[PDB]
């Protein structure tokens, strides 16, 4: 998802009370809102509850080196929550895959589609199920029945883009208190009028 | 104004702080399972304060009862009021 | 039912390098923000750090932590000890919509 053309607020992205878990990593998540970039690059995709703490710089795995790397110059901002009830049902959710095998790395903010048998051997095997060739792409083992570190958890990241670009997507002035019968100073639009 | 959240948290004498609860200047409230159904926390904004009522209140609740700004609900709090000393007993 | 598991006497000479851990039980270490309160006794606490590497504008850089979310432990680390660091320290988290501390 790209953003752009659009004004948004990250207050009412906050107040909700119902992620599991947050982080945000380059900005203070408290004032992140009045900082101005230029685009918004957002990625929604599922995971299970012992691969969340896989999302961050710095580690080495099975699911952030073979489907999406992160780099160390990361300023990107992950959501996850739990949604269990809708994302999963009785007799086997099996609807979302993932990679297992991959023939060496990738770049980070690339993705890998190539639905073709990885080779262990020295030999072709010509797309078959036989020896020294496995599927890379794999089944998942949601079950709504399960505890907490295997459930289907609903991540995304939201990532800011600084370019050489004037400011698209971004906070604007906070709508502060409106005070009375004092001598305040106001600015609506047009005057810097001092009085009451 | 500013959108920032309230929070009570007490500390007995020698022991960890504990998380009573938070409020917004709206009706949103959570408290904590050990001291759910027993904190009734109220705002408002004509005194500009907020009160914390606990019930069934007995010789355990001995604590250092603080008041904290929340500008960051999940995360750290800036500010913290003086500590009140409350004793239950006789 | 997530706690926060913290050494309860932790001893150093001033001028040495000690390690403070923050272990969680459940969930995660990494999943929530991590902050650790310098509470002097008699005294309102403070925040030492926030962000599990942010420190705020005032306290001395010494006050460094460290998140190992192999081992679902919070470090912090300080370095060079004096006088005035002899306080207690609380580690706080957030879960889901209940504030745990240390």
């Known amino acids: 998802k790209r953003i752009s053309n659009c004004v948004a607020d990250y207050s009412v992205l906050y107040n909700s009370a119902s992620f599991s878990t947050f982080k945000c990593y380059g900005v203070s998540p408290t004032k992140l809102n009045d900082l101005c970039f230029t685009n918004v690059y957002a990625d929604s995709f599922v995971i299970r509850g012992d691969e969340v703490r896989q999302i961050a710089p710095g580690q080495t795995g099975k699911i952030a080196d073979y489907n999406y790397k992160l780099p160390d110059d990361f300023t990107g901002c992950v959501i996850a929550w739990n949604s269990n009830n809708l994302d999963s049902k009785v007799g086997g959710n099996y609807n979302y895959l993932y990679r297992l095998f991959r023939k060496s790395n990738l770049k980070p903010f690339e993705r890998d589609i190539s639905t073709e048998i990885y080779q262990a051997g020295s030999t072709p095997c010509n797309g078959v199920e036989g020896f020294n060739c496995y599927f890379p792409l794999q089944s998942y083992g949601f079950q709504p029945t399960n505890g907490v570190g295997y459930q289907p958890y609903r991540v995304v990241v939201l990532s800011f883009e600084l370019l050489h670009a004037p400011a698209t997507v971004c906070g604007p002035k906070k709508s502060t208190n409106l005070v009375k019968n004092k001598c305040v100073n106001f600015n609506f639009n047009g005057l810097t009028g001092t009085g009451v | 104004?500013?959108?920032?959240?309230w929070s009570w948290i007490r500390q007995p004498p020698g022991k960890g702080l504990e998380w009573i609860g938070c409020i917004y200047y709206s009706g949103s409230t959570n408290y904590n399972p050990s001291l759910k159904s027993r904190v009734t926390i109220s705002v408002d904004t004509s005194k500009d304060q907020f009160s914390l009522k606990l019930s069934s209140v007995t010789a355990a609740d001995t604590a250092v009862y603080y008041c904290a700004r929340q500008l960051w609900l999940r995360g750290r709090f800036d500010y913290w009021g003086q500590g009140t000393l409350v004793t239950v007993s006789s | 039912n997530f706690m926060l598991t913290q050494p309860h006497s932790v001893s150093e000479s001033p001028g040495k390098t000690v390690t403070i851990s923050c272990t969680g039980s459940?969930?995660?270490?990494?999943?929530?923000?991590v902050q650790w309160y310098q509470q002097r006794p008699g005294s309102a606490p403070t925040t030492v750090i926030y962000e599990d590497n942010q420190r705020p504008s005032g306290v001395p850089d010494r006050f460094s932590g460290s998140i190992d979310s192999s081992s679902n432990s919070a470090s912090l680390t300080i370095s060079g000890l004096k006088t005035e660091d002899e306080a207690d320290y609380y580690c706080?988290?957030?879960?889901?919509?209940?504030?745990?501390f240390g």
């Open positions: 104004s500013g959108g920032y959240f």
């Open positions: 706080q988290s957030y879960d889901s919509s209940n504030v745990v």
């Open positions: 459940s969930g995660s270490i990494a999943s929530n923000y």
